[PDB]
Amino acid sequence: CGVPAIQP
Amino acid sequence: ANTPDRLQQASLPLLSNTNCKKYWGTKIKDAMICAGASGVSSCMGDSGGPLVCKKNGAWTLVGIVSWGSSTCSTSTPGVYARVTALVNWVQQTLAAN
């Protein structure tokens, strides 16, 4: 629910 | 021109409303949250975007860019809509629509 697949 | 064609990010610390009034006084209401004054600042065109913080390993929306330095000074805090004070409204709207 708030976990980008591409990490910031 | 001073607008970025590429998406920009920045880290900034949250402030207490206590602290934010030192700068903004009375303009600061309960449904607002300040962040920054640490050398970065939201500026024209950033309105409506997110102010997120990591909780339980996930990014959570804490603020919505609302207003700030008429000159975007990096010494002055940006003011964001306090999502915690507005969420019951979101969820209820979501529930009925």
């Binding site: 697949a5 | 998406l7 920009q8 990010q9 449904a31 500026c43 975007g49 860019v65 809509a81």
Partner: protein, 131 residues
């Protein structure tokens, strides 16, 4: 943002750009669902504005994104246009967004959550890099 840095494209997948009819950026917003966007009430969003998702750069002759129509706007009735208090608006898409590695939702808090003074948070957007 003044004094920020460029993001890795796709790394802030809930970030959207709101475009007017001429067709250019007037505010950001965030995806909370495949059907809804939260933004500020003062942005004055209308049904003719468009939501843009999956976007990194604004000068591409053409890029791979999603331009979503708005079916209805829900401004908070508490919104005060003088005070700017209760600055939020919900946008109901007329075409759900298509989540992917680059488009997804941010989490929403609870009304009782505490985010303590001092937390290092992050803000994103396409606003000016200098006044």
């Amino acid at each position: 943002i003044v004094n920020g840095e460029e993001a890795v494209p796709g790394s802030w997948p809930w970030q959207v750009s709101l475009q007017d009819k001429t067709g250019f950026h007037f505010c950001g917003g965030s995806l909370i669902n495949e059907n809804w966007v939260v933004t500020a009430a003062h942005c004055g969003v209308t049904t003719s504005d468009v939501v843009v998702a999956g976007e990194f750069d604004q000068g591409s002759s053409s890029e791979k994104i999603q331009k979503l129509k708005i079916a209805k706007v829900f401004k908070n009735s508490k919104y005060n246009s003088l005070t700017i208090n209760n600055d939020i608006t919900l946008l109901k898409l007329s075409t759900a967004a298509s989540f992917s590695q680059t488009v997804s939702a941010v989490c929403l808090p609870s009304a009782s959550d505490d985010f303590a003074a001092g937390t290092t948070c992050v803000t994103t957007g396409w606003g000016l890099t200098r006044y």
